[PDB]
Design a protein around this nucleic acid. Structure first.
Lengths: 71, 132, 119, 91, 40, 178, 123, 16
RNA sequence: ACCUUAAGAUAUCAGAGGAAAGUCCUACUGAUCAAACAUGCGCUUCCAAUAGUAGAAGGACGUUAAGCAUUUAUCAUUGAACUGUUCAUUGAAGUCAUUGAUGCAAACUCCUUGGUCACACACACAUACGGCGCGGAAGGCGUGUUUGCUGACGUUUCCAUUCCCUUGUUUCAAUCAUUGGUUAAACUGAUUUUUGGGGCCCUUUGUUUCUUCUGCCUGGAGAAGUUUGACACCAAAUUCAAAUUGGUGUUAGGGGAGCUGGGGCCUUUCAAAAAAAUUUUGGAAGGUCUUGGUAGGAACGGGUGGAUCUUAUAAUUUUUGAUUUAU
């Protein structure tokens, strides 16, 4: 329908809180109309253990997607 | 059993039960009956409406006596001590000072208590027809 | 076949709607929106006590019941008498219909019968 | 819908919105979409237990928003009036 | 006078939450089985 | 089909930037400014007062107020009250728009001036300023203007006083300043 | 207050509602628009029962007195997903006759202004 | 074109 | 420079007719429903002292107030003494608060709101209480008429088509005029001009707030105007003002005459049933009382707006369940 306005967050480090407790930081690579996001070089902030080279996050469990860069 | 006579009471309350509850609240702060709403008042047809001897009220919607209302008590001595409660400081319900005087004739309920304490009953109901 | 259409056929009858919180609304039922957005009028909300000493109750349900604004201060149990509570559709869990109505005359889906006759 | 159009009219002004997790956010509203996704700028966040921090931007999914508080002056918006006149749209 | 009129309200005060946390929110788990009812 | 309610122009159905283009132009940027100026102007101009319930005064209340005196009422003509209302509204607007910035002029030569008062190189709201004035750069050092008093600055502006009370001022100053 | 039996959410415009949420928080403000049933409230103040005083509502002085923390927040749009049920509390400031009067007033003014706008924009 | 599921179909079907 | 569209429908069943089986339609006909508008109920609840200095409802994001009672203020590493305790060092985070938070309670101050209406200062009532003054607010129920969601826009070779007083008010008297009733000489009532008196109101605060202009407290006044118009105000830039273009509003309250929609009651006349005598039902006309309206309305129309309804749609962004805190 309407693609979310994330064309300015491309290839910039962001930190988004999975569900209500987890917080994942990575480099955004793409997104879908459901607000699914694929972010590379993830790191589960808590010491903090990396996730993998390429992860996808279902847009249902995303709450906020604040960006840790110039934007 | 002697009924008291009250003047300068508000005529706004409309409903008889609501008026009785409001007047009872102003008579007895923190009363067991006035503070808790949705309580059916004890209708003593021939049980205290309020403690310290308050038995029943008797109001009328007739345009002749609008502000006037009557309080009927359980015992005369209770009624006399109610006057000492007034002690000539103007009791106030809502915002208007009320004047208080003993009624010229006790109420029908007080008459019934006096009669039990049945010809007087039949005479009273027969008197109702002639004056109507 | 949509049972919302059957539910729309009551329209003036006493129901007992039990929400998902646990609170059960009793009152005359007015029109029902096609999303099951019930509108009851002379309602008497209540909260079932679980009858078990150590299991206390729902708490958010008590908060909502009191904040409705109709709870009797002297009431021993949690009941709140008020008029016209509008209930969102998704909150209803089950609706206890009255016992007296007939189901055979109300359950006949007129639209489905019309479609079957047309076909 | 009227509320979505009101949130659209509320662009460029400081709004405060509380999520379903308990957090609170307030700041300039950069962009909003028809599905209640909002982008706040210079937001001052209050995590549920009371701590307050600051971030440059944020993009919160609309499915989590509880309510959004816009400036009070928007009560006089032209799209809140019921009887309206239309310019007779062309062919 | 550009934005002198859209002055927002003061920041909302903080109140301690009275609900369950987003991590602890769930429906009823340990829903017991249906087989036991069939016997008795 | 969605049209702007300020421009009143009927816009062919859009949802993307087409609505971010219309709302970011000039016929929808200042024409939405004139609208809310008028609506806020009204709530400033409103003079309707609360409903008046007049109770019948009693004799005890009337006799004392009748005893004292009658009070004259000051009244103006139509043109005079027009002029006075215009002056009062203008004065209210002028005072409301007034902002005091004495502290900004006082610290004009502070060692860390360009990082705080310039308001474009600040660290909180500088992210917004960072197609469209001799701006003060952040790279200024205190070696520039080692001695501020070398005729560079000017005296502090004298305090303002109310003009309607301008005859209240003392006639002569204590000392003779040239 | 008494409200008409046949009164949907469209009739309760500028009534001062009592909107309840899933998390035990109520909102008390004037309804001015709706839609998914997500309202717009004018001056709604949010109330809640603190966890320290929740225990007084449980079944057992005679009359309960609950101190409810309330926050002031204005012209807020809710989301229909969280709304649980709505109750009515107070009537609008204006009577029904005055409401009809102002509606007729604004309709007359709008018709005249539209006629003048057409007359200007054509010639 | 209704819910985004149809649009995602008209992407996944081509992807496969 | 980006954009050019989800599709359908507009009360419902039953009966008669028209274009074997549907199919559509009927300024067709019944019954139900819904909406609007009139109109009623011995319907139900609510509408503040002035015979007084009050009170009711709701607030305070108000004070006393550091009130009275409890309770809180990190984690890891290393060294030292010590029978867990104390002192120092490195690293890690860290909402502000401790005059806080939480529990309890009271006094005080102040804001908004209301018929602060009229007649009364009264001996009532068991069938318990004339609910038998005028309004207003909110619902409940009933009847009548119209409609079948609703509104702008165009066309008509459609219909429509009004005046008057007034802007403190009320009351008494002097006087003038008019009109009726009885004996135009007398008396009596209704309307009006001028002057004076009494009461109340002026916060009407931009001194009546419908607009402009003149104007006012020893006063309540004068002139002009009233919707394709006028008036007030806002914003700009030309480098003061004026100019224009773009906007937001205001154009009111009361009374009367006509004209007209509705109810109640009465009269007459007509029709049917139980008849030219009686009653009930329907209609026409007239009288009386009341209540509402008074500048738009009908018909046709479409690449017209908006509501409601159905289907996509029970598949991550709202309604076909992860907030009864659980094992």
């Amino acid at each position: 329908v309407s693609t979310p306005e994330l064309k300015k967050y491309m290839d910039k480090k962001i930190l988004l809180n999975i569900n209500g407790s987890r917080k994942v930081a990575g480099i955004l690579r793409g997104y879908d109309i459901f607000l699914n996001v694929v972010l590379d070089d993830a790191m589960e902030i808590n010491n903090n253990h990396q996730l993998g080279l390429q992860t996808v996050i279902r847009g249902n469990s995303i709450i906020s997607l604040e960006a840790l860069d110039a934007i | 059993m002697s009924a008291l006579y009250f003047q300068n009471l508000p005529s706004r309350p409309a409903n008889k039960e609501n008026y009785t509850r409001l007047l009872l609240k102003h008579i007895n702060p923190n009363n067991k009956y006035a503070i808790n709403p949705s309580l059916p008042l004890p209708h003593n047809k021939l049980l205290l409406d309020d403690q310290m001897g308050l038995l029943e009220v008797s109001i009328s919607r007739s345009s002749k006596m609008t502000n006037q209302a009557f309080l009927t008590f359980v015992t005369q001595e209770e009624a006399d001590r109610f006057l000492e409660k007034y002690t000539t400081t103007a009791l106030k319900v809502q915002g208007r000072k009320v004047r208080m005087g003993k009624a010229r004739t006790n109420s029908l309920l007080g008459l019934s208590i006096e009669m039990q304490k049945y010809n007087l009953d039949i005479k009273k109901v027969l008197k109702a027809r002639k004056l109507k | 076949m949509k049972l919302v259409n059957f539910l729309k056929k009551l329209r003036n009858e006493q129901v007992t709607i039990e929400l998902k919180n646990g609170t059960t609304v009793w009152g005359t039922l007015q029109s029902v929106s096609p999303q099951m957005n019930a509108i009851l009028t002379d309602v008497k909300l209540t909260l079932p006590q679980p009858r078990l000493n150590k299991l206390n109750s729902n708490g958010i349900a008590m908060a909502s019941l009191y904040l409705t604004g109709g709870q009797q201060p002297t009431a021993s149990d949690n009941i709140a008498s008020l008029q016209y509570i509008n209930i969102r559709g998704n909150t209803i869990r089950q609706i206890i219909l009255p016992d007296s109505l007939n189901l055979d005359s109300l359950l006949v889906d007129q639209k489905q019968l019309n479609s079957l006759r047309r076909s | 819908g009227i509320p979505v159009k009101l949130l659209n009219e509320a662009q460029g002004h400081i709004v405060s919105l509380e999520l379903t997790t308990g957090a609170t956010y307030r700041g300039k509203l950069v962009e909003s979409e028809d599905s209640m996704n909002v982008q706040l700028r210079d937001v001052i966040a209050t995590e549920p237990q009371g701590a307050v921090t600051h971030m440059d931007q944020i993009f919160v999914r609309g499915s989590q928003i509880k309510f959004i508080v816009v400036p009070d002056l928007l009560k006089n918006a032209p799209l809140f009036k019921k009887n309206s006149s239309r310019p007779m749209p062309p062919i | 006078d550009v934005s002198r009129l859209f002055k927002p309200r003061p920041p909302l005060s903080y109140k301690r939450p009275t609900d369950y946390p987003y991590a602890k929110r769930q429906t009823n788990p340990n829903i017991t089985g249906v087989a036991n009812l069939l016997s008795t | 089909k969605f049209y702007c309610d300020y421009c009143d122009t009927y816009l062919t159905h859009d949802s993307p930037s087409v609505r971010k283009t219309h709302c970011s132009g000039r016929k929808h940027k200042e024409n939405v400014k004139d609208y809310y100026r008028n609506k806020a102007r009204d709530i400033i101009n409103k003079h309707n007062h609360k409903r008046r319930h007049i109770g019948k005064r009693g004799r005890k209340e009337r006799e004392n107020s009748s005893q004292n005196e009658t009070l004259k009422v000051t009244c103006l003509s139509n043109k005079e009250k027009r002029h006075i209302m215009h002056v009062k509204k203008m004065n209210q607007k002028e005072l409301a728009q007034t902002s005091i910035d004495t502290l900004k002029l006082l610290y004009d030569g502070s060692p860390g001036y360009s990082k705080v008062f310039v308001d474009a190189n600040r660290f909180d709201i500088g992210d917004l300023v960072k197609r469209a004035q001799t701006s003060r750069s952040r790279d200024e050092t205190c070696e520039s203007n080692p001695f501020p008093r070398l005729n560079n600055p000017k005296k502090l502006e004298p305090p303002k006083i109310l003009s309607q009370w301008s005859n209240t001022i003392p006639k002569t100053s204590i000392f003779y300043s040239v | 207050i008494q409200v008409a039996h046949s009164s949907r959410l469209a009739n309760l415009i500028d009534y001062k509602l009592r909107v309840l949420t899933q998390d035990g928080r109520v909102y008390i403000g004037q309804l001015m628009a709706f839609d998914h049933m997500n309202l717009v409230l004018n001056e709604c103040i949010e109330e809640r029962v603190p966890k320290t005083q929740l225990d007084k509502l449980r079944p057992r002085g005679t009359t309960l007195n609950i101190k409810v923390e309330k926050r002031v927040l204005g012209l807020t749009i809710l989301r229909g997903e969280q709304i649980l049920s709505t109750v009515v509390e107070d009537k609008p400031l204006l009577s029904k006759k005055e409401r009809l009067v102002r509606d007729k007033k604004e309709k007359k003014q709008a018709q005249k202004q539209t006629k003048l706008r057409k007359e200007k924009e054509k010639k | 074109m209704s819910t985004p599921a149809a649009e995602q179909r008209k992407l996944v079907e081509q992807l496969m």
